[PDB]
Copies of this chain bind each other. A is one copy, B any other.
Amino acid sequence: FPEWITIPLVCIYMLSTNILLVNLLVAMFG
């Protein structure tokens, strides 16, 4: 349970979720 290696995981998870969400929205409008 190392935090110094946990923080990048949450960072990348949030980045991936945000990029997927924006891609979904833009594709839907198109």
> Interface residues, chain A, CB within 8 Å of chain B?
22, 26, 28-30
Copies of this subunit: 2
Q: List 5 A-B contacts (CB under 8 A).
A: A22-B28, A26-B28, A26-B29, A29-B29, A29-B30
Nearest B-chain residue to A22, judged by Cβ: B28
Nearest B-chain residue to A23, judged by Cβ: B28
The CA of A22 and the CA of B28, in the complex, are separated in Å by 10
Q: Shortest CB–CB separation between residue A25 and chain B, in angstroms?
A: 9
The CA of A29 and the CA of B28, in the complex, are separated in Å by 10
Across the interface, which residues of B come within 8 angstroms of A26, CB to CB?
A: 28-29
Q: Shortest CB–CB separation between residue A26 and chain B, in angstroms?
A: 6
